Every structure is written in C-alpha cells, then in structure tokens.
Amino acid sequence: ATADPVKDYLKQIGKVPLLNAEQEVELAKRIEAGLFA
DNA sequence: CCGGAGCGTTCAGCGTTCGTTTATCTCCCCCTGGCACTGTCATCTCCGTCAGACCGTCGCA
C-alpha cells in the first residue's frame, strides 16, 4: 500500500506462471468441462 | 291611396374548403457486437523555496 497504485497493481500481478500451448489448452478443456458441469 | 317593385337585411337547405391528425416511407444518428500467425510490464519525475515550527515516528540508550 504505497503511492502510485499502478506500481502496486503490477507487483500484485506478481510471479504468476505464464501458459504455454499445452497448459493453455488443458485450462481451456477444464473451462469447458466446468461450464458443462 | 294602398300596391307593387326595388331594395336592405337576415336566415335555413345542401356544397366545398380548412385546421389539425395519422400511419408509412427515406435518410440519418447511435449503441452493441466482430474481427482469429504471434504480438504478456510504462513513465518520467525531483534538485540552487524557506523558515521554523508542530508533530509523530523510530532506533539507540
């Protein structure tokens, strides 16, 4: 919680794992499965 | 010596024309939705106030 909240938001994004092709299509399949459920 | 004709004014028959509306047809404005090689972290601030106080804050003692 500091000034210039855009920097705090960018740090809040943090080190999230980027998605390659296989992880992205697996997540899309899980998206469709959860939607169907 | 009234009588008639001509003239002034004032109204009832139907006959046309207005005053104000209505739905349909072009032209335009305005808002929500589509785009499928990939493309995954910016941005320059801020200095030669200034003058000292008021105040909380904070690590050292």
From Swiss-Prot:
Q: Where are the transmembrane segments?
A: none
Source organism superkingdom? Bacteria
What role does it play?
A: Sigma factors are initiation factors that promote the attachment of RNA polymerase to specific initiation sites and are then released. This sigma factor is the primary sigma factor during exponential growth. Its activity is stimulated by RbpA.
Quaternary state and interactors: Homotrimer (Potential). interacts transiently with the RNA polymerase core complex. Interacts with RNA polymerase-binding protein RbpA via its sigma-2 region (residues 211-347) in a free form.
Q: What is this protein called?
A: RNA polymerase principal sigma factor HrdB
Family as reported in the entry's similarity comment: Belongs to the sigma-70 factor family.
